[PDB]
Paper text:
TRPV2 is a ligand-operated temperature sensor with poorly defined pharmacology. Here, we combine calcium imaging and patch-clamp electrophysiology with cryo-electron microscopy (cryo-EM) to explore how TRPV2 activity is modulated by the phytocannabinoid Δ9-tetrahydrocannabiorcol (C16) and by probenecid. As expected from the previous studies, the channel architecture displays the classical domain-swapped homotetrameric assembly of TRP channels. Each subunit harbors a transmembrane domain of six transmembrane segments (S1–S6) with S1–S4 forming a separate voltage sensing-like domain, while S5-S6 and the intervening pore helix (PH) form the pore domain that lines the ion-conducting pathway.
As expected, the two structures obtained in the presence of C16 displayed relatively open configurations compared to TRPV2apo-1, in agreement with a functional response to the ligand. Although the binding for probenecid remains elusive, C16 associates within the vanilloid pocket. We tentatively assigned this density to C16 because of the associated structural changes in the channel pore region, and because of the lack of a similar density in other maps of available TRPV2 structures. However, the size and shape of the density does not completely match C16, which may relate to the limited resolution and the C16 occupancy. Indeed, the density is also compatible with an alternative C16 pose in the binding site. Consistent with C16 binding, residues H521 and Y525 that line the C16 pocket rotate considerably between TRPV2apo-1 and our two structures to provide space for the compound. Interestingly, the proposed binding site for PLG28 is close to the C16 binding site, but without the H521 and Y525 movements. Notably, no indication of a ligand at the CBD site is present in our structures obtained from C16-treated sample. The putative C16 binding is at a different position than that proposed for CBD in TRPV2CBD, which however is a closed structure and retains a lipid in the vanilloid pocket. Finally, an important observation from the comparisons of the structures determined is that C16 affects TRPV2 beyond the local binding pocket, and thereby significantly increasing the pore width along the conduction pathway (and see below).
Numbering used by the authors:
A (entry chain D): 258 to 415, 429 to 513
B (entry chain D): 643 to 693, 701 to 719
C (entry chain C): 76 to 415, 429 to 561, 591 to 693, 701 to 719
The structure:
Amino acid sequence: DNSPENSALVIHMYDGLLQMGARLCPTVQLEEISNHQGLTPLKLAAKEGKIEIFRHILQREFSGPYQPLSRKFTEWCYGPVRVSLYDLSSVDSWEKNSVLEIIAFHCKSPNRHRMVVLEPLNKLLQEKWDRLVSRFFFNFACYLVYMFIFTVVAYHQPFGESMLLLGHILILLGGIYLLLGQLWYFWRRRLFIWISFMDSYFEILFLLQALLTVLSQVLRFMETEWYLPLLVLSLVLGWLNLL
Amino acid sequence: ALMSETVNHVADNSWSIWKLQKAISVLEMENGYWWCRRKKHREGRLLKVGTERWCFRVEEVNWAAWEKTL
Amino acid sequence: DRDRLFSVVSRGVPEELTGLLEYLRWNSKYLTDSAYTEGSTGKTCLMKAVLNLQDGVNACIMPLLQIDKDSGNPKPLVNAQCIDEFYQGHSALHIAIEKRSLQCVKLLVENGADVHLRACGRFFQKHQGTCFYFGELPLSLAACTKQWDVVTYLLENPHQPASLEATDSLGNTVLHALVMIADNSPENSALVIHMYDGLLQMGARLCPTVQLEEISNHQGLTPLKLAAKEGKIEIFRHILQREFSGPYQPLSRKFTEWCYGPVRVSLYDLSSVDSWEKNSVLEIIAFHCKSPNRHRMVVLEPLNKLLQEKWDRLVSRFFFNFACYLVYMFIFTVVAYHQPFGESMLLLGHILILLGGIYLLLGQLWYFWRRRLFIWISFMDSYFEILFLLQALLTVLSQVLRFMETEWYLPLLVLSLVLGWLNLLYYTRGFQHTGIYSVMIQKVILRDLLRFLLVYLVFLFGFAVALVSLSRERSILDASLELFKFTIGMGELAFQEQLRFRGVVLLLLLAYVLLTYVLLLNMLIALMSETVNHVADNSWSIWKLQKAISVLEMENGYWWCRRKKHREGRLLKVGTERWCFRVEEVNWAAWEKTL
């Protein structure tokens, strides 16, 4: 538990047991053994919310004969510039069910936001974000274009008839695509989504907007007089979801 | 009440939340679209020989630590 | 590659190798030279001989001690590693200096090492891998690494004495390199200050006829100006007010005396003077400074009182300009109002406004000509200079459009009038009580509000389009004024009677009103959250910087009359010959410290 004395006790005991296990049995990976839930001590520490032992395990280094039992290797290279190498068993979706996914999704503790700025994870996530900003902006531009087209079609709705039909069918395809994407997302993440909802409330607003759009578009074919209110509600919800 | 919530504790307790949101977003994006499963990136491979394991390399200029040793 | 076996051998017993190398060499001795081409991909054997790092002496009987015997190509001047190898551009002397091996440096310099050998290749690694810009000279590398003995041996070397005034490719000297590597940390600041003082004293001792600190690099900067421009403050402050007591007294900038009892009077040397001898410290701080620390360097000690005196000497011109602008605005307002003996007065007013507008436009163009594209340094503090230009341009364009008798004269004239009336707010630079809050609230507004109007306008347009699309079965898209009436107080929220889908319209209006109230609440709370109680002294500095910019602009004089440069606080006299600024202060703790 996150207390000054217990953290020191558990760190000391962990290091001593690891060293003695290396001495007595140098041919077994103690830290690679997994329990019934399919977790290692590092993953278990990440999931349970413990941060002190998690941080110590993440960046521990040994200097003497126990050097192989280390995760951070430090050297001085060229004068007063220190270069350090961190072992990567907390890698991203590759070899899935890793530390990053566990922190992001399966973590009930309110301390999950404090474990993403430790040292390896912060720079790794910064690099990943810098590598994928282009896709984010491309998706933003595509959504803006779709919203503009839908607004134009809604306004011009009473050669023109063909354009209106093309706009309506394009909106139908866009709505069903968004609905199917949200359903796929909710299929990937099971009822475990009950972990929290203060940070994933847009994923249901998008689903609601897509469902309303699809329902209005399919209701138009029956020529019901309730098409306009549902279409307008879908338009305003999609415009609000841009935030 | 909304003013009373501002206890001046979000100086670093709000930046962490933004970092977590960015992490969730990048995790969602790198998984790829449903109609096209994107190939997993090999990240910072740097296999090499550590004293054989993939590693992530970070450099920093430190003067106090350097001046500590002679 | 096995052929590189000759690169590394068992040191201490080079009998057969040396015997076969010098002379003879079967067919010809030139093969030995080729051994330096095939030794590695750019690294010679001497580099590895230094890098062995054995106990005590690194290479015991170093092969170089006999290599110079069979030398036909200058080997002590090793060709620095080329291409990209994360260690390119390093010579044997650089490697010896790095490992803090004074003995290796001595043996290399005894055999005729080439001092002043710029690191040819290191500037590749400066951008490829580890930057560590140290000065590209062995002396600079020794000084920046805190090795006093190596520097001492290199300078007063009987064989090859290093020159303290030597320069690298960029034009930097050892002092420039020390300034450049400095960063605002407690340890590095002390290290660089100590090294700077020691090097200055040793340069005075060895060469008392050269001004080391007066040497300028390619950019045309001195160590003081370089420190001011790069944003370093600790070394800048130390250089600005350093004093020496012993025989090194002339190498000082602050002279302190007690005068009459417990009142201490101090004289500061003035090489950071104003526009006189232009390209000085004040101009560099005011204009050419990308760092956000520029506002913290105007309250150090000489600069603060100098700027205070300059402002006190030029408040009259500021108020005269304010009065003239107010008179012009009043005349323009009167002419605009009275515009439909009277015809002559109206024509005189119109032509006077034309002259005023062209004068303001030409003044702004002159200002933008004096400050080139370098104005890209910042814009959070110089946004009035474009508003004035816009207002002058609009006024001139409207006045010239009047002569063609176009019917668009009135809107442009009214826009010019309102812009000129709004531009009057710039003159709140004085009146400290207003300005301290005004500068910081301006920064906050410019940073925050620019990301409100976009999203609010987007939501308003979306809701308006939805309402006009629903109500067609509010008649046009331009009828979005209802939402603005709602956000200002009006709106007439009521049933539409004839519209059958009245419930949907009511729900949309409710959603819009709650959304906009929530957004404005968010902005309010964010603006409050900005107030972290850190502007207690971080906002007064901004006001001082604005006053400094204003006085720099004013003292330059008008474009049509170049004002003569003021001789400032001359006080030439005799300092132990240099212009000085005198400041007095009553101190009791310092006086009571001595007896």
